Design a protein around this nucleic acid. Sequence first.
RNA 1: CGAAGGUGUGCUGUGAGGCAUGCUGGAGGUAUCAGAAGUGCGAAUGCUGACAUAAGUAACGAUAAAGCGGGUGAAAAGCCCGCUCGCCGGAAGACCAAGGGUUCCUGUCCAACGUUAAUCGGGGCAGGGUGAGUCGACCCCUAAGGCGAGGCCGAAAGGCGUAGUCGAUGGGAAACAGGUUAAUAUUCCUGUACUUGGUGUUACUGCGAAGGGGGGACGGAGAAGGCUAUGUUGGCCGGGCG
RNA 2: UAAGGUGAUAUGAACCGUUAUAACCGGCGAUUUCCGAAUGGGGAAACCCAGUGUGUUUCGACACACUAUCAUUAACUGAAUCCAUAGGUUAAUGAGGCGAACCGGGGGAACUGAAACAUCUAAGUACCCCGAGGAAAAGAAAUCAACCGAGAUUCCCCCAGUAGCGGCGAGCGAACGGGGAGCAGCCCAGAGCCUGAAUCAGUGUGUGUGUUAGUGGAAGCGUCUGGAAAGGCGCGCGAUACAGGGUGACAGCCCCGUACACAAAAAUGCACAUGCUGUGAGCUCGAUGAGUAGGGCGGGACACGUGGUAUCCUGUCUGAAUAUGGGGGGACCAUCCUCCAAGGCUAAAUACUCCUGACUGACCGAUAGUGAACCAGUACCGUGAGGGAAAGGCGAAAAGAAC
Lengths: 46, 63, 89, 77, 102
Amino acid sequence: MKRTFQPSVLKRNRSHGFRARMATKNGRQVLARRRAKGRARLTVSK
Amino acid sequence: MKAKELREKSVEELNTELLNLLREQFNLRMQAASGQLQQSHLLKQVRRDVARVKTLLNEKAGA
Amino acid sequence: MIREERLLKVLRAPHVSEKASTAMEKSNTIVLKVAKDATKAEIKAAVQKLFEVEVEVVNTLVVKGKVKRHGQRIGRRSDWKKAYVTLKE
Amino acid sequence: SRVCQVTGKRPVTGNNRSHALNATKRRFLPNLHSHRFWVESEKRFVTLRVSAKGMRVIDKKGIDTVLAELRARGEKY
Amino acid sequence: AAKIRRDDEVIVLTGKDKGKRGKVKNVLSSGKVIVEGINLVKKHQKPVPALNQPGGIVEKEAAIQVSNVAIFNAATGKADRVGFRFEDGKKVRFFKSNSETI
RNA sequence: CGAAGGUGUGCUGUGAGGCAUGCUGGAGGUAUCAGAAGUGCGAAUGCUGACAUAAGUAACGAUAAAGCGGGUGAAAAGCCCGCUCGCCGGAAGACCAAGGGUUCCUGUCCAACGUUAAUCGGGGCAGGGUGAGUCGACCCCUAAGGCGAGGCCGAAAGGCGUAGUCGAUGGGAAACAGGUUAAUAUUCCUGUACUUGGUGUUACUGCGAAGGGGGGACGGAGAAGGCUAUGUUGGCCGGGCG
RNA sequence: UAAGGUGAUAUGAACCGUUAUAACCGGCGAUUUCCGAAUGGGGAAACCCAGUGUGUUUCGACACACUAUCAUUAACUGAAUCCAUAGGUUAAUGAGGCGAACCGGGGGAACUGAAACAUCUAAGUACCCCGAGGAAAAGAAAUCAACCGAGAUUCCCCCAGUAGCGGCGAGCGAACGGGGAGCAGCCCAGAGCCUGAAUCAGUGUGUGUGUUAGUGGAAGCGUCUGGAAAGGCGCGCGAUACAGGGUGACAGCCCCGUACACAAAAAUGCACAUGCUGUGAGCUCGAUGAGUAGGGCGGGACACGUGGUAUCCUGUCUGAAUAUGGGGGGACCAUCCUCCAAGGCUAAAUACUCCUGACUGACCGAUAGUGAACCAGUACCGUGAGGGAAAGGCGAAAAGAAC
């Protein structure tokens, strides 16, 4: 069985990284909601 | 040190004092990493001295 | 200028180990912990002007911190830079 | 977007009403056309996206003052 | 702005050492002073062999609350409350019940 | 000279209840009459924590397989060493990419972890370890694609796209053999090299781009030849004659 | 202000102090790495790569500063194409991003109710987007009224679940008028007499009262139980202070406070008087907002669902008179009454609480109260959006158990 999560940091950073949220308006709304909740990891960047 | 004593000094004397303080800082931190300096506290005071000189090196140099 | 101030600030500590001692014997190479910025040219300039010794070549590596546990806190140690400074024969 | 430059007309909204009074959201669009007007002040042609009522305005009040209030409101021509 | 100071002599108003007097060694920011030879606790001093080790059961002085001590009057011999007056431009302490400066 | 709470006992009321007092506990409680309810639980395949039962039961994760001696230790079927036996060997060996992130190495510890014990460990703890002009990234160039000044379009948000600018999984300069650490090596060391730029005199001299031309620069299948990697044999060399 | 300190877990080490530049607290300053609107280009956030100019070169390189885009303005150029624009360069100013609710506008559901359901409801709600402010919106009658009159807007209580609207069902629901809170009016469409005219927007000068550190601040002893007195008993005192909190058990007189009386070098907030800069004031004469009012068709809002439907806004096609005139008074006509659209600005009464301080509670007390009293938006779960715990208590004092 091959599972659904086949990791890759390039596709991870291109799909859910900080600049991929900061490109669009809805990603900036995502970041505003993460800061309003107060989360430690804003995105998955490292 | 006496901050007023550094207020009575000039640009060149304060620059030579800054470079001498940084040299003494380097000697002390290499000695502290080497094993000596039972008296550690001088480290802190030397750091503060350099900061004070840089304050006047902005302040006497002009507003 | 502000050259020699940077030279005073780049060096941090000498390293003491088994590999450092074997280096200084078998290769006349000193091992020392530098700042994180620390280009090799300014490392060579600093050790030449402050330590009165001519320098052949400088290798640099980066030592990553170990993720230690204290009590229950996970804490990473600080990330520092090591330099093998080779002296002239 | 479908904005008349002279009159400021926008597409407005409303309902399709049926014969059984079903209401569906529709839009009313302005009668927009691009027309080029001969302005003899700067003595060339200026294209404007205007409504037909905007053309009637330019026929009533001359093009030279309508371009002046267009310059006043800060539009492009 | 501090009534019981370091080298003052005090009496104790409350405790196993009530009425007994002594001079204050040190003042701690927890609202507690140490008065030597007045509040003796018997600590079991554990030896930790990376030094020289006395060991044993050593009696030392514990912290007593500053509300429990009061400045000795040293004339009549009873406890006295102290306040602050401006005998001259430096603020100074003084005993109540007789206007005498400490 | 002992409150709430807890835990017994004795009384008492038609009942929900109440009063007394023993032990625990160690600082709160509250008459009477009024007032206000998050006011009374056994059930909702209720929710949360604790604890049972099955039950010391099934199981202990490839049917590649172990046996003995010595050591260490409080203790050895499992650790270390040694000798035999077995298993893989187009892998169950050796190098990497991705992905992990210190799991690597040494000393020390055996509570928890390890489906058993553990003196062992990928476990805890302290220290150590990653060395590059040539390897890779970064860098120069581009594909699919993305973003995209102006622009065009769209109630607003925004959509599409030009010039550009990113984008490798592709194209582009250069290093090998031997040795060395407990842990790194085409990185350190020895020997022998190579590449690209700047700078400075020297020899001649028309050079110069964002433009032109070439080159880079390319499919599948098949077949043959020449080689080499590599292996076998013989010679040679060192030991043996059981 | 200060005789004690070097933040906490958190000991230790080396020090710094005590009459004043130890430490602490406050006003103003300085420095402020990198990412982020991220602003020199790019990028997989916290990284890579530059260009230009100046000064420092021991010649291997350094150190600063500038270089985004858009809008507006201004200056140089500048095509097709004489002219000229388009375009290009440069400078100056301004904007951009974030933030809890309140506010205004552009779009805009469905579940649901109607005991089904399509008109209707839910509902202009949820939500999305744009924009601004400490409030915002409106706002000075082409308004109501009734032959009497009131005089801008907003908010609260009545009118009134009333007139009405409505598959006349489910439901929706005014106004006039009355009582209050708060009250404030103006200006351009244009000239002449005139220029510090009644005032407003900004700088300094001064005063008051604030805010940002602080200071002083009353009066209790013996005795019994008890580990410990603040408790019991007795005998006193203060109180413009018996709010509160600690103190070895319950303290007005032990402490910090409290009532009270005071305090600011420097920075601001609000009132003033004052002095510059812009700006008009006040009399006379005129003018008085045209693709507009209205109409036809299609929608929407008014409580009002096209109905006999007044009024308002509009996508579309038309289209006046212009104060001897025009709007409205709920189809419409005539007479009366009342106002003057097609241009603007405006305080207060009103809404809200991310945050700051103080005070309060017939609010909770650790399965409660915030998800979170404890290193909680944490561990952990998920590719992501996102979801999301459990966990308080020795003692008075560690005196935390030497041997």
